């Protein structure tokens, strides 16, 4: 057998269907070839044959696959606005065509909140769960009625309608059925036919099945799933009804699930509805047909399918859950009670026990209209199945003590203070009865804190409420159990060491550790006060003889990291080492020998390698002594296969030019300077350390790996030994410190590695306490009903710090941050080392006459800032590195979602608690994953009232440290802060309202006292009142002033976009970024 042969041969060879390839290839080839009269043939043939041209060939030659959305959406959405004058077709076609399918988030929020006028962007963009959706409808209607210069936008109208149905979903089905008489081809038939079927409805079921099945195009499996489930369901008892319906299709519809393989979005989605509907319909139809066909009263229906089928099906189906799935599956799968109860104990227990999961799951998981709109034998079921109105209506129709005490104390406690009122009702109602759960925590914490806040004699009676905590000794545990530790603060309001001596010692010693081993942290900080006993015997005996390996990291790290100071370590280490050594065997021989030898084996080399020693010794000796006997010392020590061609050029030039005069100095200086400077690492533990060996893993010792050995996370699992690896340990690139990245190869399922950040810290070992603040992020795991499943949980690692300056970080794919990857990747390629700020500041600041005569201007900043600061190094590095670093949809989607979620969650979660640093050395990252892991005076108010000592000082001093990048701050993500406002505003605004628990203990214990110089904080913070502000004033003022508000009259609350617009507009500009004053001098 160039565009005419490829377009004519490729477009004409495929015709020997096939409409999109011939129409798109003929129209694009004819329009581009006829309108462009060379990169399309090479890029299309090389890019399409090796695996604009790659997105069209790879995105169009897949026969409409799942991977074509990235190339088609990226190529069709990469250029739309800011081009000539056509924007309605690109904005409407790109927003309407890209604001569908399943993967949206940033596309739906940015396209639905930043396009044309968008009058419904507040309720539509701020909706999500459907909170402010209640009104949204009102706003839409109003605009419609008004008009007069409206932007039409039907899509908006339809959205409003859908929202309306959702709101009126289930509960408001009354009027929704009217839609079946008009608007609602699938919503009226599916909602009205699925929400209430009948027994002898042949015409009502034959029209939906015979009219909702014509192709049927299941993709889009709403009509096929509703018609198949509605047509196959319903016990009609028509002889061959279950056999013909279950034998004709049934399993064949499962083949439609294979279509999901062509569109995995997202993971389950259709698998839960198809598997739950097919398994529930097949199990309910088979059990109802067999039980209904095997008679009953005639032999009382025997048994078999009763306790095992009802207990296994009700326990597995009711207990195996995750909104629409609970209401649709629970409301649609409740048809078995009519067939088994109408042809007569299982209907009342199954229907009453299974029908209550939608109110508790929807009302407890949807948290305003869901809980208020979704909610002698008839008095208990009718009154229990669901200030004077709650007590009179709930008590006029134990539940009385928990409902009256929890409703009266929780509903009457705020107000503001408490004092009395709920003190007698909470203490009297919680100091008796028997089993209770919320009364001990709510009435115990509120009555103990409010009653013990006055610090008097009667407050000592509140210590008796601590006995109620014993009632929680057999009620499992959980993170909320940590709140019980706050009750220990009530002991501070007691007398000396008595009061709760028998109750605390007997209750704490007669039970397990629970919160005495899994909590730790703050418990390891109470040492200067009277904490040498009380819970020391129960915590040391239970944690040392009940928790197995749990006190080895805290005892070895706390005892080995750091005249009362010189005598406390001998008595504590002698008593703990004697009681533990006499308790176990050998208390911790493998942990003490392995931790002492491995943690103390870094003292001897503690060296470099061959290039640093040969280049430093040859360069220092030759450069310091020069200002073939001597040439044999560098060749014998620099021969390690890392001198190319330094050994050949230095040995050949130095050995060949060892005479004359100019050849020796020129060849020795040029060869020694170029060879010694062009090759300037490794770490060999077998020829320096030699401890890992016989640390043979210590002949397979009985010890866990470092990092995966805790009391709560991964507890009582496959705890095996780690085989480590060889001895060829390489450093992490080469920053300011020698990061010794070790390798921990585990053949028993522990193949990982280790790291070391040399031995330097800011506040020494106390700086490690700052890492405890990261543990506060774990508290979010106790309050994430939708952020944990919608935000892919959060980034967290395992870092075991050794001694007082060593840290064992986890590196999955090397380690790279912002300054290392930006400075190393941007300062490479050409001849670059110290430019950007040095070349721009030195050339721009030294290009004029230094005098400066006289001001001048010479403004300002301004053009000098834009010419000596904005000189590229922003969109080209982030766009070229982020765009060129990806090669498929997994790298772009995983890099964009992981970078946006990790940067927004790490910046929003790490930019608080006096840690809002706009410079580097903060939120770090890696490579393949990312993440970010690396006064005035006193004026005290004595006592009594403490709601008037609000001294707010506002004086700017020092601070600064708010520059550098920026740079690609508004271009590193996606259109500034489009996708970060939903996760940052929703995740940051979703908390700080309930489920506090750890607040006064972590804030008061971590903030009190000041470090260092314990004089003003220790001598001024030791009072005899309630709160001393500091943590309460900073946390209440910052959280209350920064998280306000959430509700109003017409759903007009701040943030919304007040935090992103005020923070981005007030932190990403010229005077704001150049004049510092970011977070008001770190708050401070």
């Amino acid at each position: 057998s160039a565009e005419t042969i490829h377009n004519a041969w490729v477009v004409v060879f495929p015709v020997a269907s096939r409409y999109e390839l011939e129409f798109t290839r003929a129209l694009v080839k004819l329009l581009f070839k006829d309108y462009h009269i060379p990169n399309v043939i090479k890029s299309l043939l090389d890019g399409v044959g090796k695996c604009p041209h790659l997105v069209k060939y790879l995105g169009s030659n897949y026969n409409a696959w799942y991977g074509a959305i990235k190339l088609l959406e990226e190529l069709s959405e990469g250029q739309g606005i800011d081009n000539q004058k056509i924007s309605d077709a690109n904005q409407d076609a790109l927003l309407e065509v890209y604001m569908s399918l399943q993967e949206d988030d940033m596309f739906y929020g940015t396209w639905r909140r930043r396009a044309k006028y968008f009058e419904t962007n507040a309720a539509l963009s701020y909706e999500q769960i459907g909170i402010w959706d209640k009104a949204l409808q009102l706003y839409e209607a109003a605009q419609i009625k008004a008009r007069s210069g409206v932007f039409p936008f039907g899509e908006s109208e339809y959205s409003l309608w859908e929202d309306h149905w959702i709101y009126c979903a289930e509960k408001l089905q009354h009027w929704e059925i009217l839609t079946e008489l008009a608007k609602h081809e699938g919503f009226t038939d599916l909602l009205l036919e699925c929400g209430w079927r009948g027994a002898d409805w042949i015409a009502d079921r034959e029209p939906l099945e015979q009219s909702v099945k014509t192709v049927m195009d299941i993709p889009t499996p709403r009509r096929q799933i509703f018609q198949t489930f509605l047509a196959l369901q319903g016990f009609s008892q028509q002889k061959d009804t279950l056999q013909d319906v279950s034998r004709l299709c049934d399993e064949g519809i499962q083949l439609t699930l294979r279509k999901w393989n062509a569109l995995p979005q997202r993971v389950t989605r259709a698998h839960i509805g198809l598997l739950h509907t097919f398994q529930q319909y097949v199990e309910l139809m088979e059990a109802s047909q067999v039980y209904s066909s095997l008679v009953t009263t005639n032999a009382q229906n025997l048994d078999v399918k009763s306790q095992e089928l009802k207990r296994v099906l009700q326990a597995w189906r009711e207990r195996l859950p995750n909104d629409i799935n609970i209401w649709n599956d629970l409301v649609t799968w409740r048809q078995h009670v009519f067939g088994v109860i109408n042809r007569v104990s299982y209907a009342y227990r199954g229907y009453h026990e299974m029908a209550w999961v939608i109110n508790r799951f929807a009302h407890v998981a949807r948290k305003v209209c869901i809980n208020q709109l979704t909610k002698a034998f008839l008095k208990l079921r009718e009154q229990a199945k669901c200030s004077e109105l709650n007590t009179g209506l709930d008590v006029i129709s134990a539940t009385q003590q928990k409902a009256e005490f929890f409703t009266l104390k929780g509903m009457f406690l705020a107000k503001l203070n408490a004092k009395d009122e709920a003190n007698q009702a909470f203490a009297t109602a919680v100091q008796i009865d028997l089993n209770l759960p919320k009364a001990w925590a709510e009435w115990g914490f509120f009555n103990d804190r409010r009653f013990k806040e006055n610090p008097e004699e009667i407050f000592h009676a509140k210590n008796a409420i601590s006995c109620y905590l014993q009632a929680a000794g057999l009620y499992k545990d959980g993170k909320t159990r940590k709140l019980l530790c706050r009750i220990l603060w009530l002991i501070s309001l007691d007398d000396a060491a008595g009061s709760l001596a028998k109750t605390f010692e007997d209750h704490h010693g007669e039970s397990p550790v629970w919160y005495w081993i899994t909590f730790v942290p703050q418990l390891l900080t109470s040492l200067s006060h009277k904490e040498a006993k009380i819970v020391r015997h129960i915590l040391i005996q239970i944690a040392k003889s009940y928790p197995q390996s749990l006190h080895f990291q805290l005892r070895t790290t706390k005892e080995d990291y750091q005249t009362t100071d010189s005598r406390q370590p001998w008595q504590d280490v002698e008593e703990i080492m004697g009681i533990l050594k006499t308790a176990y065997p050998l208390l911790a021989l493998s942990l003490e020998s392995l931790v002492d030898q491995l943690n103390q084996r870094f003292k001897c080399n503690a060296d470099e390698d061959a290039y640093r020693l040969v280049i430093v010794l040859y360069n220092d000796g030759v450069q310091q002594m020069n200002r073939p006997a001597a040439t044999e010392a560098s060749i014998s020590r620099f021969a390690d296969s890392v001198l190319p061609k330094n050994i050949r050029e230095v040995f050949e030039q130095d050995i060949i030019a060892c005479n004359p005069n100019l050849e020796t100095y020129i060849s020795k200086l040029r060869k020694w300077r170029d060879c010694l400077e062009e090759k300037l690492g490794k770490a060999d533990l077998e020829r320096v350390s030699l401890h890992l060996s016989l640390f043979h893993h210590q002949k397979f010792e009985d010890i866990e790996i470092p990092g995966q050995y805790l009391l709560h996370k991964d507890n009582n699992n496959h705890f095996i030994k780690i085989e480590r690896f060889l001895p060829t340990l390489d450093l992490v690139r080469g920053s300011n410190g020698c990061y010794k990245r070790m390798t921990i190869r585990g053949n028993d399922g522990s193949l990982h590695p280790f790291a070391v950040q040399f031995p330097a810290a800011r506040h020494c070992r106390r700086e490690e306490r700052i890492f405890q603040l990261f543990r506060i992020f774990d508290d979010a795991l106790s309050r994430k009903v939708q952020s944990r499943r919608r935000n892919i949980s959060l980034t967290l690692p395992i870092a075991v710090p050794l001694s007082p300056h060593i840290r064992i970080l986890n590196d999955d794919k090397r380690y790279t941050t912002l300054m290392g990857i930006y400075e190393e990747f941007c300062r490479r390629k050409g001849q670059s080392r110290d430019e950007p700020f040095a070349y721009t500041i030195q050339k721009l600041r030294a290009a004029f006459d230094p005098r400066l005569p006289k001001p001048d201007i010479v403004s300002v900043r301004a053009e000098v800032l834009a010419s000596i600061q904005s000189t590229l190094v922003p969109s080209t590095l982030l766009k070229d590195y982020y765009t060129e670093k990806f090669s498929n949809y997994e790298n772009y989607w995983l890099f964009r979602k992981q970078f946006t979620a990790q940067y927004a969650s790490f910046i929003f979660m790490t930019y608080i608690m006096c840690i809002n640093s706009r410079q580097p050395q903060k939120i770090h990252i890696n490579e393949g994953s990312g993440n970010i892991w690396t006064s005035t005076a006193y004026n005290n108010s004595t006592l009594d009232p403490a709601v008037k000592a609000g001294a707010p000082i506002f004086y700017n001093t020092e601070s600064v440290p708010f520059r550098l990048t920026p740079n690609i701050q508004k271009f590193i993500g996606e259109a500034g802060l489009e996708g970060i406002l939903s996760v940052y505003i929703l995740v940051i605004a979703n908390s700080l309202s309930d489920s506090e628990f750890d607040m006064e203990q972590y804030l008061s214990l971590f903030v009190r006292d000041e470090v260092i110089s314990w004089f003003a904080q220790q001598h001024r913070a030791s009072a005899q009142t309630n709160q001393l502000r500091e943590i309460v004033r900073v946390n209440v003022e910052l959280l209350t002033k920064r998280v306000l508000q959430l509700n109003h009259i017409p759903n007009s609350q701040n943030v919304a976009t007040q935090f992103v617009l005020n923070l981005i507009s007030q932190a990403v500009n010229p005077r704001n970024l150049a004049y510092t004053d970011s977070a008001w001098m770190a708050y401070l």
Partner: protein, 510 residues
Amino acid sequence: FYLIRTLFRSIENLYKEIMPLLQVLLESLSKLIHEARRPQERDIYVELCLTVPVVLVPHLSYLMKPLVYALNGSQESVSQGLRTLELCVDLTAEYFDPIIEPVIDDVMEALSKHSHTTLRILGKLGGRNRTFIKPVDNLPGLSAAFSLLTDPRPRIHYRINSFKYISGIFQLFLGATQLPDDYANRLKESMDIILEDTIAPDEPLNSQMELLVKLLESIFYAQEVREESKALIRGTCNHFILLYFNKMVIDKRKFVRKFSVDNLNENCIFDAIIYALSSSAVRSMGLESVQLIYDSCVPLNVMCSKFIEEPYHKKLAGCIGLEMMLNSLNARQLEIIRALFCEVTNTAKRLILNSLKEWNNDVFSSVFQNLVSSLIVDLEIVRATAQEALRTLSETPIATMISPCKHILLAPFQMQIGNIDAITFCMEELNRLVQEALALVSEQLVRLRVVCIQLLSLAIRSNIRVKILVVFFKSLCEIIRAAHGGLKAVIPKELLQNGLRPMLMNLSDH
């Protein structure tokens, strides 16, 4: 018990390793007994021994461990460990193993679980290619609607027959299928009944190793393949080592040559790529046509996946293009990787060692001995084959060569031949004798102690090292105490009587 214990414990490896699948499956498929220590010890030892040495071992071990481990009684640690290791090593593969592992796993998990479901499912849950790598003879609008609806500008071009014919033909042609029972309800219900998803996540994703590993593995794991691989490896290694060794100064002798001798695309690339991609033939046609046209006129998946008529063109085009392109512009990685993986190791090691060692002088012996000893001694069949082949083939420095046999053999048929040949053929003394003799202390103690004591005592200050090490090690303290005390003490009256009376009195009084 005698056949499974003797045949499974007595292990030329194809009959003994493959006899347990048919013997244990056919003998255990009659619903009998014989378990407890036999199924538990056989499943734990078979999973640890079969998984510690990691295509016949994965298919035979994964396909044979489920038949012997899934036919017991209870579901304790043997079911979670054996099912987690066997199911984690290979899941839904080898056709028969996929249909034979899902029935026993789903029936055993559902029947045995109907606290084990939370720990077994949560501790053994793994999101892989189960929903997309199943099929087993089983049997769209985003790109067409977005790509076809995103444009439609400029002028007009019908734009109705494509959407109507594609939607009606695709929905009408795709909405009707056919099936005949077979195994649709079991695979669909058993494979789709597990409803325990946990989001998705799993980002990760992300030049001498690909060319050296692909050229050395593809050229060494392959007549034309032996002549082209031997001539290309010998010419590339000799030309790269001789050309990169920086020699030829001002010699007066001869023998200083033989360094180099060897030295329309739009229609063929567009027609071959469009015609071959618009219809296994795309990799051979595109790689052979692009490699032959590009290499004659002027990638790792086809050579790596096809090298294990397309093998000669893929191996010759990939090896010639990678060797010529990578060498036309490192001896430890190519020589160790090409010689450490049986005629290629002896021919490449003997030809490269004889030609490189005879063609040269302290830089070649010091760099070759230090790089070969450090690279060969610094690195389960790769360590024994590379250390035994490199040490036995290169040994024809007592601390580095004596420390690797005792440290590698004591930290874990090749150990006896390698340790006996290297220790017996490889033969200041207080540190090596006291450290090796005191640190080297059932065949490793008798072989190392008898070989070191016989060679050190027969080839010619041990009272302080033997008395201090034996008194401190024997006085400082179930198989470690009896084996260490009996083996270390069977080779001062208070330490011998008081220290030896507890072993005979405690061992004889029980």
